[PDB]
């Protein structure tokens, strides 16, 4: 270990802001954070987004002042979630302390996706987990789905889920403030989102039982996900398969018709946190001789179906350093080294075809037609390399 | 509460500098997430080299003296990686303002001069001094008072990577100097080598390109290396001619100026360039560019300068110097909200400046172009886009009048057929 | 008599005056009825020259009919000769002059002024601006340029760049730079920046570089037939064609192919991570035949986005566009009607349309990104800056000029319909 | 009698159709005229303007029956595509004139079958018998004979001037209150005037040299007064109008604090302007003799030259009276000798048709564009104040540029 590569947690803010509308995602700190968000967004900063960027006792007084400034400039916030960053946790600025004290309609909730603690997409983890604690408990068998998956495909997931025969959904990412997901002891919840380890842990900590979660990335990735959903709700096999075979066929045809040029490949997964799930997604269509698949944060947990359905070829190395991982990349010579960060494009500048993670994260790739173009996403660098060599 | 930040943090400028210096490295205690700027110079300024600046990325399990140990571990590993030519130390200050600087193993390398270090002031800077405290240190240490070579030589000082069209400014000024007979010993701030930066004595006078980063280097070099710099700037026809006067005066050579190419003074003299007479124009952006552009506007363009505010208020007096030159005052604030308010108040017809002012004017209907530093990928171009010299004055016409083409042809279309 | 509310290229006499006002010391007395002098505004106001486009019209009125208009032509030519004292007089007509059967040739021939008199009797109801420029420059070389002893060093007369044209001033410089760096000497740069003496000097070389086939192909073929100098086939538009041109002329001159690649950024700027969303975009390419022909090569090989539909209004250069289309299995739209381009890009709805300024405004109407890569343009597209299109800097300019519509469209969409 | 720098009247269509929004100016002619209209309209040709600009091919060049047959078929296609055109305008051109294409015969034959749905008028914009802005005059003289005949004694506003210009004219007129004001340019049928033996052609624009004769053939009368182009020009135009109707001077001087006093104030508010400098009028807009007098008296002009495409004795008569005798109304002006005279005189202005504006700016001489003047609202009281500033601005351009 040594130097790291991946983004800090604030890159998940660009997705959380887009997905759940009535929310606030103000980060704190220096221009290094206010500029990662800026450049990553591109035009969001011009579209006047819903987040911001603020300018031990002195630090806490400044925290209170800046939170009041949030409440002032946007007098329409009721289910805000402040975002922590590296300096705030360096001086250990408790966002819960500011939220609880300054809640006295005005309900302030905390969240800390700081890259010193957080990683590439664990900001989503920390935020979705921070939704859970204060909320009370529900007392019925619902299916509390989770994850900030695209709303266009959130409709597909809800439609399929109700076709299974489930009760209420009440998705944990609060895209409406009124829609408050309670954490019930009888609540059985799946996991759409692979980087929801902290969220799943906190949801089970409050009491909600968790369903087996092979994460939904088309074909078996979502097959076993929704199968676990069905066998947990006791949906008849002939009911589930009847109402879900067509999405399976659509995704299977789409991935095959989108990965024609992805044959004879070695997809190195430098640390998206999708790495085990995407590694399994890239085994059957055409030829994907996957190689070392690292993550910025890995737990098997009950998230284990990834590794259970994963092969042994690609090394599941948790914790890495690009300053030697790229040496391993040179030695390996992987024909598509999808590299989250650290080196990234210079890999394409030293004869290594490179794919980048946030394209996968911020482009609908979850089951049906969404996972259908996951193959197209992974073919993007390859279809570039085929011509613009 | 800056939803958009004009310039980056004070480390991205140092990385800008080191990107054009093949070999020179910079040990920065930047947590993972501060490595987003490792993208900038291959993502925004799409190049093909990982920035030569060390990163440590100390995590949560690494707070305190552990960061001090990671400083030395990263330094040693970075040296063993590619055998640098110089090492610069400095932190993002977040958990350690001044409290892990550890030269112990940064020195004891094959590096002749290990005292090289860039400390950037805490929460008081942007992407100008990041590249300016570069050449106040990296050229204050590894640059020798070498003998002035036989022909009258010079140094192209100032241009840093991820800079506004700096790579083409370099070629235009080098072409001017070579056609005038002035040798260019090295383009030291950009596209150079540590051997070239050591060769700063073989230059009869530094040729300054912009105060943004090269002003400190030029002032120090004239003070120390005994080679004066060009106090004028080659942005603008009159400024270009005065720059030629200065370079030839300090050279002792003929003021050869290739104005054959120059077309702004004429293209701003046609009667298409008469309907722009008195057009109120707002000018926000970096001081060097704003002063040069506003002089050009006010006298030779036809526009009337109604705004000259800036965000580089460090050298505050030379800002309002040109404002009294035009009879105005300077908005030296550092927020785009004030820019929006000022352009709403004066309702100009051209809001020449950053991409942020570009998007304000897109949202406020006013025409606008890019003349300033805070720009994204599209304003760091592949084409030959030099903002300095005679061709710099040439591009400063078309760049400024394309938004007027917008604001005129759009108006005609929307008013003719409705 | 169709309702052509927009002609693609102007009357061929305008193209003829593009050659005229390009050369110093060459005066184009024109027998244009008063008012046809707008083209003077074209040359001093689109291209912005600080000198009356030295095209001294006659501007005959209703009072000047019959032989009075011929007398006015005589008078105008004589006043031009005793006023500006050109080194070679250059005569021609306009549409209405053809309708009068004005015969600008015999008049100025019988004037018997010592300087060379060239004729420009070109059709105006069948041809357009580009043919006028090409034919005028070819006739210029035909009268003045003569086969003479070659330069002691290898020389590379540039052929094609006329004065009023979409970025001729900068490709003349770019190709001069390429040839001088590689080892060849630019003997002349006709017809832009040249003169009758330079036209005579065209003979001292070893090959005749063809920059613009539309405006200089006749000149290059005539030079290879008469001056005994093989014209370069591939134009330096695009990295592949730039290397082809470099190697070709390094073979004609027998010199080492030195070509400074420290400037070329198009292959890296496109073959990278961001410019990978290009791959798959269904582009449509209309406009000037040669520029769009090589634009197809750049777009496919070195840019990525897939080509659907590529026509060109130039008819005399139809077949090379048909070939460039059939290389990718495409067709060629070879008419000169803007509505046809309109419904073509409706039927084949693209994301990046490369074409003229009329294509730019067509796409502005529908709302798809559009670039300018072709001839009929406005004051904006004639730049003061270094904006070439032939060479390695030409490839860089092509990259940026094409990507800017894409960035424009992307920012316009995502701004305020994704956030 | 050599080269002259001035447009053909086809460029009047660019302002003509912007007033009469129910008119199609189907400009026949060659590709050269089409390129003129294209370049002149600039970006306007892209938002489907009412030009048509139908070019004649070489196959359509020869013969006359084929040309009008194709013209008929495309006119029918256009009116089927755009059934919102009533006052059709088959504009001639130098090519069309040389072919001797009969626009009047075409008008008769076409109103035979388009009927009241499309009432066609025909005029010329050909440079052979027309200049820059005498196409406006021919257009207005093409609707004057077809104007509704009557006998009611009333005044007009002859001249296809901007809509705001007419609005201010009539608002001032009713503040005075004089007769039935009937704006001669019939933008549609809702504001169709009535001309007759007791009417008057209250001309507004000097190039209106043929509509005066036409609506004289109508039998009406002239307000013998200087063409209204400023404080005193419009002052005498309006004063003579009311004296032809008999309106007391009490209202004259009681309602003219905002219009007249501020008109002169705005005109003479050009401190630099052209006070004491010179102008050398090339043939530009039949509008130089009118400008010279009120630039001389109010803006302080030397007015070395008053060169005009054609000078009309009577209609600019009172306008000529206020003009100095020094400058000479040279006609058929050869531009070359005129450049020689500019180079000798060293003026501060060289108004022209000006494809030699930038060429004359290169030799240091300041130049101003009268085409924008004919386009810009420059008439009557509130908009001649910026007529003066429009002349002034190139002077300041030279001052800052040199
Ligand atoms: C924070 C660093 C960084 C930079 C400088 C930008 C801007 C920008 N980012 Mg990439 N972008 C960054 C991060 C991200 N980008 C974002 C946006 C965006 C996308 C969708 C795309 C991309 C790209 C770019 C672009 C160029 C956009 C282009 O020309 O298409 C810049 C420099 C562009 C590509 O070619 O590279 C992956 C591409 O299609 N980014 C996203 C969300 C997916 C993230 C978090
Ligand atoms: C025939 C060549 C030419 C070109 C290309 C245009 C467009 C255009 N001509 Mg001017 N212009 C020429 C002539 C004329 N223009 C016309 C219109 C017009 C005016 C009033 C104005 C303008 C102008 C220009 C310009 C500047 C572009 C701009 O205004 O947006 C173009 C390319 C501009 C300028 O100051 O020049 C006189 C301006 O104020 N054109 C007219 C009368 C219709 C003609 C005959
Ligand atoms: Cu634009
Ligand atoms: Cu733009």
What does this entry show, briefly?
By secondary structure, chain A is mainly α. Chain A has 17 helices and six strands.
Characterise the protein shown here.
The complex is a heterotetramer, with 2 copies of chain A and 2 copies of chain B. Chain A has 17 helices and 6 strands. With 389 residues, chain A is mainly alpha-helical. Chain A has 3 domains: 9-118, 3-Layer(aba) Sandwich (Rossmann fold); 151-250, Nitrogenase molybdenum iron protein domain (Rossmann fold, 3-Layer(aba) Sandwich); 261-385, Rossmann fold (3-Layer(aba) Sandwich). Chain A has a two-stranded parallel ribbon with strand order 1-2. Chain A has a two-stranded parallel sheet with strand order 3-4. The longest helix of chain A is centred in the middle third of the chain and has 22 residues, at 237-258. The radius of gyration of chain A is 21 Å and the shape is globular. Chain B is mainly α and 418 residues long. Chain B folds into 3 domains: 12-125, 3-Layer(aba) Sandwich (Rossmann fold), CATH 3.40.50.1980; 153-251, Nitrogenase molybdenum iron protein domain (Rossmann fold); 264-416, Nitrogenase molybdenum iron protein domain (Rossmann fold). Chain B is built from 15 helices and 8 strands. In chain B, the strands form 3 sheets. A 3-stranded parallel beta sheet of chain B has the order 2-1-3, sandwiched between helices. In chain B, helix 6 links the parallel strand 4 (153-157) and strand 5. In chain B, helix 11 (287-301) packs parallel to helix 12 (316-326). Chain B is globular. The chains are: A mainly alpha (389), B mainly alpha (418). Chains in contact: A-B, A-C, B-C, B-D, C-D. At the C-D interface, helix 2, helix 3, helix 4 and helix 15 of C face helix 2, helix 3, helix 4, helix 5 and helix 16 of D. Bound molecules: Protochlorophyllide (2 copies) and copper (II) ion (2 copies). Chain B: It catalyses: chlorophyllide a + oxidized 2[4Fe-4S]-[ferredoxin] + 2 ADP + 2 phosphate = protochlorophyllide a + reduced 2[4Fe-4S]-[ferredoxin] + 2 ATP + 2 H2O. Chain B: Belongs to the ChlB/BchB/BchZ family. Chain B: Keywords: 4Fe-4S, ATP-binding, Bacteriochlorophyll biosynthesis, Chlorophyll biosynthesis, Iron, Iron-sulfur, Metal-binding, Nucleotide-binding, Oxidoreductase, Photosynthesis. Chain B: Pathway: Porphyrin-containing compound metabolism; bacteriochlorophyll biosynthesis (light-independent). Chain B: Its EC number is 1.3.7.7.
């Amino acid at each position: 270990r040594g130097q790291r590569e991946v983004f800090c947690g604030l890159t998940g803010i660009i997705w959380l802001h887009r997905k759940m509308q009535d929310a606030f995602f103000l980060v704190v700190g220096s221009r290094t954070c206010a500029h990662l968000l800026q450049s990553a967004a591109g035009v969001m900063i011009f579209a006047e987004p819903r987040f911001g960027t603020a300018v031990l006792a002195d630090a806490n007084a400044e925290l209170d002042r800046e939170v009041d400034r949030l409440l002032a400039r946007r007098p329409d916030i009721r289910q805000l979630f402040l975002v922590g960053s590296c300096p705030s946790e360096v001086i250990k600025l408790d966002l819960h302390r500011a939220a609880e004290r300054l809640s006295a309609a005005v309900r302030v909730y905390n969240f800390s996706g700081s890259g010193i603690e957080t990683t590439f997409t664990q900001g989503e983890d920390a935020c979705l987990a921070s939704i859970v604690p204060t909320l009370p408990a529900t007392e019925a068998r619902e299916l509390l789905l989770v994850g900030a998956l695209p709303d266009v495909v959130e409709d597909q997931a809800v439609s399929l889920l109700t076709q299974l025969g489930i009760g209420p959904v009440r998705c944990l990412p609060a895209h409406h403030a009124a829609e408050a997901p309670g954490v019930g002891p009888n609540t059985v919840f799946a996991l759409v989102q692979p980087f929801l380890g902290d969220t799943h842990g906190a949801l089970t900590r409050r009491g909600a039982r968790h369903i087996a979660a092979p994460f939904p990335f088309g074909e078996e990735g979502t097959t076993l996900w929704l199968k676990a959903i069905a066998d947990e709700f006791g949906v008849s096999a002939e009911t589930f398969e009847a109402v879900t075979a067509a999405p399976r066929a659509r995704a299977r045809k789409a991935v095959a018709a989108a990965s024609e040029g992805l044959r004879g490949k070695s997809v190195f997964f430098l640390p998206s946190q999708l790495e085990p799930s995407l590694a399994r997604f890239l085994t059957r269509e055409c030829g994907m001789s996957a190689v070392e698949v690292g993550t910025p944060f890995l737990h098997r947990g009950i998230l284990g179906p990834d590794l259970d359905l994963l092969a042994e070829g690609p090394v599941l190395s948790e914790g890495q350093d690009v300053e030697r991982q790229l040496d391993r990349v040179r030695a390996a010579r992987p024909d598509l080294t999808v590299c989250g960060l650290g080196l990234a494009n210079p890999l394409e500048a030293e004869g290594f075809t490179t794919k980048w993670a946030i394209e996968l994260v911020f482009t609908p790739v979850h089951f049906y037609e969404q996972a259908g173009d996951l193959a197209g996403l992974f073919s993007r660098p390859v279809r570039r390399r085929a011509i613009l060599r | 509460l800056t939803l958009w930040t004009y310039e980056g943090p004070p480390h991205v400028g140092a990385m800008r500098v080191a990107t054009g210096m093949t070999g020179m490295h910079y040990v920065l205690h930047a947590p993972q997430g501060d490595t987003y700027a490792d993208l900038l110079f291959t993502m925004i300024e799409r190049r093909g080299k990982r920035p030569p600046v060390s990163y440590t990325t100390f995590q949560a399990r690494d707070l305190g003296s552990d960061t001090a140990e990671l400083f030395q571990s990263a330094c040693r590993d970075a040296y063993e990686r590619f055998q640098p030519q110089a090492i610069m130390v400095g932190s993002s200050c977040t958990a350690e303002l001044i409290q892990d600087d550890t030269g112990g193993l940064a020195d004891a390398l094959s590096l002749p001069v290990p005292v090289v270090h860039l400390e950037l002031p805490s929460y008081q800077r942007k992407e100008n001094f990041g590249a300016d405290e570069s050449f106040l240190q990296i050229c204050r240490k590894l640059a020798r008072p070498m003998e002035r070579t036989e022909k009258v030589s010079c140094n192209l000082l100032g241009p840093t990577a991820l800079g506004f069209r700096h790579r083409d400014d370099i070629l235009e000024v080098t072409r001017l100097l070579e056609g005038m007979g002035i040798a260019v010993n090295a383009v030291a701030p950009m596209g150079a080598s540590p051997a070239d930066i050591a060769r700063l004595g073989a230059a009869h006078f530094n040729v300054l390109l912009y105060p943004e980063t090269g002003e400190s280097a030029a002032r120090w070099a004239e003070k120390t290396l005994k080679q004066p710099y060009t106090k004028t700037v080659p942005i603008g026809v009159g400024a270009t001619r005065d720059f030629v006067a200065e370079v030839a005066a300090l050279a002792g050579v003929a003021p050869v100026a290739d104005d054959s190419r120059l077309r702004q003074p004429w293209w701003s003299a046609s009667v298409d360039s008469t309907y722009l007479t008195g057009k109120r124009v707002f000018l926000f952006g970096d001081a060097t560019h704003v002063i040069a552009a506003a002089r050009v506007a006010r006298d030779e363009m036809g526009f009337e300068v109604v705004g000259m505010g800036c965000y580089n208020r460090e050298f505050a007096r030379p800002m309002r110097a040109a404002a009294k030159g035009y009879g105005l005052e300077a908005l030296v604030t550092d927020d785009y909200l004030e820019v929006e308010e000022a352009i709403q108040a004066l309702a100009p017809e051209l809001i020449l400046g950053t991409q942020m002012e570009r998007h304000i004017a897109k949202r406020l209907g006013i025409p606008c172009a890019v003349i300033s530093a805070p720009v994204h990928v599209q304003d760091f171009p592949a084409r030959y886009s030099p903002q300095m010299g005679f061709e710099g004055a040439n591009v400063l016409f078309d760049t400024w009048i394309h938004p007027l083409t917008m604001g005129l042809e759009e108006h005609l279309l929307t008013m003719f057929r409705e």
